[PDB]
Every structure is written in structure tokens, then in C-alpha cells.
Amino acid sequence: SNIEQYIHDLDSNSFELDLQFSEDEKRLLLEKQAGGNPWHQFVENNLILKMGPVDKRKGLFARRRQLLLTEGPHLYYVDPVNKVLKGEIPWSQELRPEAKNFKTFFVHTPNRTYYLMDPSGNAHKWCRKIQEVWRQRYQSHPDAAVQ
Fold first, then answer.
1. What protein family does this chain belong to?
2. Which residues are CB-neighbours of 135 under 8 A, at least 6 positions away?
3. Which is nearest to 115 in space by CA: 50, 52, 63?
4. How far apart are CA 43 and CA 70, in angstroms?
5. Which long-range contacts (CB under 8 A, 24 or more apart) does 130-139 make?
6. β-pairing, 74-79 with 63-70?
7. Three-state SS for 106?
8. HEC secondary structure over 37-92
9. CATH placement of domain 1-147
10. Is residue 47 within 8 Å of 26, Cβ to Cβ?
11. How far apart are CA 3 and CA 26, in angstroms?
């Protein structure tokens, strides 16, 4: 049975995964990634749970990056022109995504807020997926009010 069911393609360089797959299914997802995803090389073999372009504010004009939310968890950002990892948004219990509007989201961390503009207008998809990963990482029982 086809791991395609967990995959939501948003455009040619952008998709997100439903996170309810089994370990065998993870295997097949990783297999498709390693065999066919040109960003695989940047993510330390981690399964990509969501990826897509963002414009990251810096200087006078934002810089286009491919953002990759992965197993680990990690948030990697890659320069698509020079084909080089530029950095990672550090994960911790204090990490918080925030959707400013349909096309702007922040990822707040202790020393830095990352100011990301989603050219596709899907900031809330980004925030929900990041927060879903956060919940699974930091909450023993994510559906409980408190832990």
C-alpha cells in the first residue's frame, strides 16, 4: 500500500506529511526521499516532514531559502542558488511558531526570532506542522490540557 496517502504536495518544490505513518511506512517515505528528493543531501538523512520556499528577512531584501522541517526534530534552511546549507533554527522547548498573517510567520527562539515570508500564502500550514512536531516532542500526551 502506497505511502502517497501521507503526502500532500503543495507545488513543485513543496510538500507536507501527515505524521501518522508506521515505521515500515517511514522506511518507504525515506526511500522515496533518498532516491528522488534533491534536498536530501542537506538534512542529515532525516525524514523531511515539510519543505518549501520561504523569504527570510535579512538586510534590505529577503533571501529565498528552502526550509525543511524534519525528523529529529530540525528546521534546516538551504540556499537554493549556491546549493548550500545556510543554517538551522535551533529546537528547544521554548521554540514557538507564530502566524502573523496568511504569508508571514515567525519562529521564536531564545536568542533570535526568524522572520519568514511564505510566497505561496501558506504560513498557517507551516505553523501548524511545526507546532504538531513540537507537541509530539515536548508533550507526553499532546491531547491533554496540561502534562
1. Belongs to the protein kinase superfamily. AGC Ser/Thr protein kinase family. PDPK1 subfamily.
2. 142
3. 63
4. 8
5. 130/50, 130/69, 130/75, 130/95, 130/97, 131/97, 132/19, 133/19, 133/49, 133/69, 133/73, 134/73, 134/95, 134/96, 134/97, 136/19, 137/73, 137/91, 138/93
6. antiparallel
7. strand
8. CCCHHHCCCCCEEEEEEEEECCCCCCEEEEEEEECCCEEEEEECCCCEEEEEECCC
9. 2.30.29.30
10. yes
11. 8
Identity at 76, one-letter amino acid code:
Y
* The three three-digit cell numbers of residue 129, written as one number: 506542522
Domain limits, the chain: 1-147
Resolution in A: 1.5
Q: Which three cell numbers stand for residue 102?
A: 496568511
